[PDB]
């Protein structure tokens, strides 16, 4: 999370962190969307370009944490997956299209004041909210900048950007299953998720019902806080895939 800020305790209840079990290793971010379903990006589990094909037995999840190292004893809740679901039409050799995966936990996590499900968007909310200029929120423990491992969960609010602008800033084929956000060269403000932040949530707060809806999943990008480049996120709504 480049240019982020230390998250207040309990800021993102849905925050989940993907870990390679042995050796311990923070692989990616992810979000809790029910007491037994986690939402994350496919490339955190399957990305042949860097020979990566994770099974359930190779993954383990930790929920309710704050620091990236220490164990949150009266707060944290470690749980193992029981099955993985990667979108059938996920495009890894081209433009990371449909970069989405569901992780079914083995034992339903028990909610607390530090662990609570994020809401999936509905047409109304998705329609009234997904508008250029409106800033969403990204959280994560990724690189403090590009080659960097944050102590406390970082947070940063980012403004959504117009599709044309997004498409123009990259040779890569942008598809309707992804949007992009970040400040423009000149607004005099910075920030951006970064590798490692991957699989994390890009959420937006609805003033109708005062609740947090998840709008995108940190997917790809070129660099981290590069000028004139914006991060892309899987478009959760266009993907609301049925597996549950």
């Amino acid at each position: 999370i480049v240019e982020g800020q230390d998250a207040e305790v309990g800021l993102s209840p849905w925050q989940v962190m993907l870990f390679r079990k042995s050796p311990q290793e923070l692989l990616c971010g992810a979000s809790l969307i029910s007491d037994r379903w986690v939402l994350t990006a496919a490339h955190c589990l399957l990305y042949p370009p860097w020979d990566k094909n994770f099974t359930v037995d190779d993954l383990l999840v930790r929920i309710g944490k704050h620091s990236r190292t220490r164990y949150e004893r009266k707060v944290e809740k470690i749980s193992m997956l029981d099955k993985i679901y990667i979108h059938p039409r996920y495009n890894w050799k081209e433009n990371l299209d449909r970069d989405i995966a569901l992780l079914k936990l083995k034992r339903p996590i028990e909610l607390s004041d530090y662990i609570h499900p994020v809401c999936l968007p509905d047409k109304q909310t998705a329609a009234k909210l997904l508008h250029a200029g409106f800033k969403g929120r990204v959280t994560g423990w990724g690189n403090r900048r590009e080659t960097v491992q944050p102590s406390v969960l970082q947070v940063v609010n980012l403004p959504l950007v117009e599709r044309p602008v997004c498409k123009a800033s990259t040779r890569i084929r942008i598809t309707d299953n992804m949007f992009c956000a970040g400040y423009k060269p000149g607004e005099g403000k910075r920030g951006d998720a970064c590798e490692g932040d991957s699989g994390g949530p890009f959420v937006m707060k609805s003033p109708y019902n005062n609740r947090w809806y998840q709008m995108g999943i940190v997917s790809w990008g070129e660099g981290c806080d590069r000028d004139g480049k914006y991060g892309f996120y899987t478009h959760v709504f266009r993907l609301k895939w049925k597996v549950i």
């Binding site: 800020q5 207040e8 305790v9 309990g10 004041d113 609570h116 609010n157 937006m204 003033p207 019902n209």
Partner: peptide
Amino acid sequence: CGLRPLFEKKQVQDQTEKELFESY
């Protein structure tokens, strides 16, 4: 869902929330 127990529930705003509505 989406009603964080230590903020929404307690009826309290977090540091950066202002920005969100402000940008709206």
